[PDB]
Structure 1
């Protein structure tokens, strides 16, 4: 219920993980 507790991991761990995975996939493959 503590709003910071939910979001700090969400923006510091989940968001960078998904963003780095997606950008690595985009940058690193022939189109």
Structure 2
């Protein structure tokens, strides 16, 4: 599995963490209280 962990983490990190991060940060930008 250790050879299969980059295949799980690189698509996880470099695509989802941009999804999560850029989405949440765009929401934090476009906010009002």
TM-score range, shorter chain: 0.7 to 0.9
Instruction: State the superposition RMSD in angstroms.
Output: 0.8
The TM-score with structure 2 as length reference comes to 0.78
Structure 1: any 5+ residue segments left out of the alignment?
Answer: none
The TM-score with structure 1 as length reference comes to 0.81
Extract structure 1 runs of 4+ deviating beyond 6 A. none
